[PDB]
């Protein structure tokens, strides 16, 4: 006759609980499937993309069970500016008798190592196959830098298409193309609205979507039926994600860099400041291993304008007091995961949308900010994400010098001015400083119809740099 909390705590103890990561693992022997890595830190990053007013927080909640805030009391229902994050752990039963489509399950971040089987009729125990994180990209036309930032942090894609609306949705196509720009061909298609459709209409939508993707780069993207209200066939989503999406090559020989996209300070209001915490920036790992008690630097830094007007970018160097990976404060960071890096920086730096799309680096490494850069770019034929009512979907216009073009370097939102244009290369001056380390693939957006529209991809070749000031 124990209460619910006692039963769940007993299952938590019997399930192994949440192990603590040892301080100094033998790094050169660990893989993302290792027990020390798979228990507390994310390994595969996946994103949800779809049209507006379709529901990406609801499907993510059904998959995982972790809600997204969608804050500011006005963005709660229309669209979101910041990232909607959630944590999912994917489990499979260790018994062969269980149904393979249904043995897959997903649970919250606070779940134990081995939860009991929730299927009535089997005494097996679940096993965490692989750890994933889910990110909610904002699907609206006014917010385009956020989607490209998500593509930069995303390594897997989840497209959402509703049924009762128009089958060839342009925003879904634009998201798919922007993800293909990010060199990501591991995409999964999902049908958002299924219940209100008939027998024939679901197949009609399936054939329409099949016709939608025949000439694009995507080849083997599966189509999955799911409903965001009944909370069913989420095991199908986890199955498809585990089977189709592999782990990108990411190991210890690569240099540590991080790409910070969000910002959340830790400052409890009303509580005495004597019990506080430093400023925390939210960023993902694309290369390198991090540890508690290191020193980081935000190289774009404080951007000051002098009397002349030149950009003085002071790197913000700081000491990492805490490393957080999706459940608890841990020590060692595996490449390919989202982490809130907390340091002793002033809380003003981590409150608002300020550290949006920037890079940070550890000591012994000097990335370079740039002012004038050279980029090799190419376009497509038709505009994506626009609705031309049956008249010749607009074709991209050629770039013009001295035009404000939003050159999103992977995730960095920079407003570049063209100083020269040739057949396939361009030169741009940046007002907001942008760093370049190795490749940092780029997307380009322009403005004609009062908004920002993606036009094509871009890759940096050279540029004039400004060495950091001490």
């Amino acid at each position: 006759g124990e209460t619910e909390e006692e039963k769940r705590k007993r299952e938590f103890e019997e399930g192994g609980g949440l192990p603590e990561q040892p301080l100094n693992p033998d790094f050169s022997k660990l893989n993302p499937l290792s027990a020390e890595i798979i228990n507390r830190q994310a390994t595969i990053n996946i994103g949800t993309i779809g049209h507006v007013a379709h529901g990406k927080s609801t499907v993510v909640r059904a998959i995982s069970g972790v809600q997204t805030v969608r804050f500011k009391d006005e963005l709660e229902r229309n669209i979101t500016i910041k990232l909607g994050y959630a944590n999912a752990k994917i489990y499979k039963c260790q018994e062969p008798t269980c149904p393979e489509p249904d043995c897959y399950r997903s649970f919250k971040s606070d779940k134990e190592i081995s939860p009991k089987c929730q299927r009535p009729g089997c005494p097996g125990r679940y096993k965490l196959v692989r750890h994933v994180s889910f990110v909610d990209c904002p699907g609206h036309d006014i917010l385009m830098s956020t989607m490209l930032s998500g593509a930069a942090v995303m390594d897997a894609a989840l497209l959402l298409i509703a049924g009762n609306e128009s089958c060839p949705q342009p925003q879904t196509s634009e998201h798919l193309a922007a993800i293909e720009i990010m060199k990501l061909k591991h995409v999964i298609i999902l049908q958002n609205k299924v219940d209100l459709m008939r027998e024939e209409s679901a197949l009609e939508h399936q054939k329409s979507i099949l016709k939608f993707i025949r000439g694009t780069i995507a080849d083997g993207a599966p189509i999955v039926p799911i409903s965001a209200q009944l909370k069913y066939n989420i095991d199908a989503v986890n199955e498809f994600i585990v089977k189709t999406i592999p782990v990108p090559p990411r190991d210890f020989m690569i240099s540590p860099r991080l790409i910070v996209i969000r910002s959340f300070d830790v400052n409890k209001p009303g509580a005495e400041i004597e019990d506080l915490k430093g400023g925390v920036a939210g960023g993902s790992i694309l290369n390198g291993v991090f540890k508690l008690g290191d020193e980081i630097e935000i190289r774009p830094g404080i951007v000051t304008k002098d009397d002349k007007g030149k950009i003085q970018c002071k790197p913000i160097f700081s000491n990492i007091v805490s490393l957080f990976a999706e459940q608890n404060d841990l020590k060692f960071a595996v490449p390919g995961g989202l982490i809130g890096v907390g340091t002793k920086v002033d809380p003003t730096l981590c409150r608002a949308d300020r550290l949006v799309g920037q890079v940070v680096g550890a000591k012994g490494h000097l990335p370079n900010i740039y002012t004038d850069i050279e980029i090799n770019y190419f376009l497509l034929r038709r505009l994506l994400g626009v609705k031309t009512d049956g008249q010749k979907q607009a074709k991209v216009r050629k770039l013009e010098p001295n035009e404000v073009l939003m050159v999103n370097i992977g995730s960095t939102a920079t407003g570049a001015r063209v100083v020269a244009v040739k057949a396939d290369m361009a030169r741009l001056q940046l007002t907001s400083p942008a760093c370049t380390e190795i490749n940092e693939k780029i997307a380009l957006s322009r403005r004609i119809e009062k908004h920002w529209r993606l036009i094509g991809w871009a890759t940096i070749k050279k540029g004039t740099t400004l060495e950091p000031i001490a």
């Binding site: 409890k268 003003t348 730096l349």
Partner: protein
């Protein structure tokens, strides 16, 4: 027994503003009793009662309630007043309100004193209230000082020292005030270490905090740090906030960041 008028004499002066409680109404007017002074009766006439046309008197006067008025003529032989009510300017009523409120406080306090000591208010007023009103114009400022500075009881003769002791006890019991002085400083630091900066800042802030009034720097926003102080003396808290601002400026000037000001220390 509430008697022994607030001022130094029981009779009015020719131009003053006063406040009155109505007692009854007759056909030619109302002979009512003054409360700014002790009890002396006087006429307010209907022609100089209401501002607009006198359509009703019950709605306007509301016998048994408090109203503003002035005095035009005085009978200084046995006691009779001629008063006015329409000639009360928009500015007159406000100062009448404040004057009556301070008078009512100083009256109720000493009325409690008389009731607890069972001695007529006349002697108590002649022994205490009158010299204080002579010295500082009004006894309420003297009561505030006695709350702060206790030299106000030097050179004044009570009927007995028990009277002074009980009166000081009632001052401590009844006239409890501080003022919530609040300021808001804009933080603009993006320097290297910026949390130990605030820690040291408020370590210094609580270091100088006096025993009598507390100093706590509350956090509401990362840029907006709020400083709330309970000014018991209403003049040293501003100095406290300025000293805290000096300390935070000294903190920020050398880490590498800057800060701004939105709300200076203001009550």
């Amino acid at each position: 027994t509430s008697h022994c008028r607030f001022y130094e004499n029981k009779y009015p002066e020719i131009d003053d503003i006063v406040m009155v409680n109505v007692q009854q109404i007759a056909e030619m007017g109302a002979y009512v009793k003054l409360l700014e002074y002790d009890n002396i009766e006087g006429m307010i006439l209907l022609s100089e009662l209401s501002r607009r046309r006198i359509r009703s008197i019950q709605k306007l006067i509301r016998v048994g309630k408090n109203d503003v008025a002035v005095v035009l003529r005085v009978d200084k032989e046995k006691g009779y007043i001629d008063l006015s009510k329409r000639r009360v300017s928009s500015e007159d009523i406000i100062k009448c309100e404040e004057k009556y409120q301070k008078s009512k406080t100083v009256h109720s306090i000493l009325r409690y004193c008389a009731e607890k000591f069972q001695i007529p208010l006349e002697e108590l007023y002649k022994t205490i209230a009158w010299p204080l009103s002579r010295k500082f114009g009004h006894a309420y400022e003297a009561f505030k000082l006695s709350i702060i500075d206790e030299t106000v009881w030097e050179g004044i003769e009570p009927p007995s020292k028990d009277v002074l002791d009980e009166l000081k006890n009632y001052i401590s019991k009844r006239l409890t005030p501080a003022v919530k002085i609040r300021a808001d400083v804009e933080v603009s630091c993006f320097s290297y270490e910026g949390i130990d900066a605030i820690k040291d800042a408020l370590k210094s802030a609580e270091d100088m905090s006096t025993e009598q009034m507390q100093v706590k720097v509350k956090l509401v926003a990362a840029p907006l740090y709020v400083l709330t102080t309970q000014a018991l003396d209403k003049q040293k808290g501003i100095e406290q906030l300025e000293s805290a601002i000096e300390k935070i400026t000294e903190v920020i000037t050398k880490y590498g960041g800057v800060c701004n000001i939105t709300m200076p220390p203001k009550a």
